[PDB]
Structure 1
Amino acid sequence: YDIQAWKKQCEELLNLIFQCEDSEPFRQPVDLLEYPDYRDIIDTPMDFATVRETLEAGNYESPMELCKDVRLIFSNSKAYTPSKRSRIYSMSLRLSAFFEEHISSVLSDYKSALRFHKR
């Protein structure tokens, strides 16, 4: 029933993701000196520090908005990878499975709490 519970649930999930070795390439923006053509392929860079900062600033209204930004991290990895067998893309696939496994109840609980609020 708690309409606000998603925020701490997302903070905790972000903490687990930061602790995970698979999040290393995604903890800060992609290095434009290392990948000089990055912005010719990727329109909207996104990373987990930006997600965490947006959440802490009180700039997400729902866990759906947070989930859209996290999914953008993974779609940017899929778009920039030169191959399906690349190291960073392989890490993003595992991290995405972990994120999706944990975010499902956060989204369901929030949507259920909002429906209860409007019963």
Structure 2
Amino acid sequence: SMEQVAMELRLTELTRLLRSVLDQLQDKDPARIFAQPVSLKEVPDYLDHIKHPMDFATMRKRLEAQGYKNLHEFEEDFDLIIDNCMKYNARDTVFYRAAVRLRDQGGVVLRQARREVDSIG
């Protein structure tokens, strides 16, 4: 149908906007602490601590499959990255500190993304 196509164009454009958002968020992690999944070879107990792991490469896979329906779903995944880190690592670690800084810097990006998603529809 013509409607299904229109819908698919919207999703494609949302995917386009979310790709730019993801790139901006990932620039706020210059140490690449959150670039890849926590290695289960190197942290073998990780899933005993963290039930829903997340990282930027995994979000990018979902993104490119057009697997985010709305900004809320994308933000859920970004919040998992931060929140998982802040639980597994202690306050006095470079990891925790990196997550705080990513959260703080990311807020600005996400604030305008929400306005753009609402605005453009």
TM-score by length of 2: 0.79
Larger RCO of the pair (alpha carbons < 8 Å, separation 6+)? 1
- Residue 81 (structure 2) aligns with: 73
Does the C-alpha gap of structure 1 residues 7 and 35 become closer, same or farther in structure 2, counting only changes over 3 Å? same
Q: 1:39 aligns with which of 42, 47, 50?
A: 47
Residue ranges of structure 1 left out of the alignment (5+ in a row): 115-119
CA separation in 2, counterparts of 1:23 and 1:67?
21
User: Equivalent pairs: percent with the same residue?
Assistant: 29
How far apart are residue 87 of structure 1 and its match? Answer: 0.7
Q: Which runs of 5+ in 2 are unaligned?
A: 1-9
Q: May I ask how many residue pairs the two structures share in their alignment?
A: 112
Contact 2:50–2:84 (CA under 8 A) maintained in structure 1: yes
Structure 1 residue 30 displacement after superposition: 0.2
The one-letter code sitting in structure 2 at the alignment partner of 1:53 is K
TM-superposed CA distance for 1:113, in Å, is: 4.7
- Give the superposed CA RMSD: 2.1
Instruction: State the alpha-carbon separation in 1 of the partners of residues 19 and 11 from structure 2.
Output: 15
Q: 1:34 to 1:19 in 2, by over 3 A?
A: same
Asked if structure 2 preserves the Cα contact closer than 8 Å seen for 1:7 and 1:63, the reply is no
What is the CA–CA distance in structure 2 between the aligned matches of 1:110 and 1:17, rounded to whole Å?
A: 16
- 1:42 deviation in Å? 0.3
Task: Write the letter of the residue equivalent to 1:106.
Answer: A
**1:1-119 matched pairs, under 5 angstroms:** 5-22=13-30, 24-81=32-89, 83-114=90-121
TM-score (norm 1): 0.80
The SS at the match of 2:33 is helix
Does structure 1 retain, via aligned residues, the 8 Å contact 2:21–2:113? no
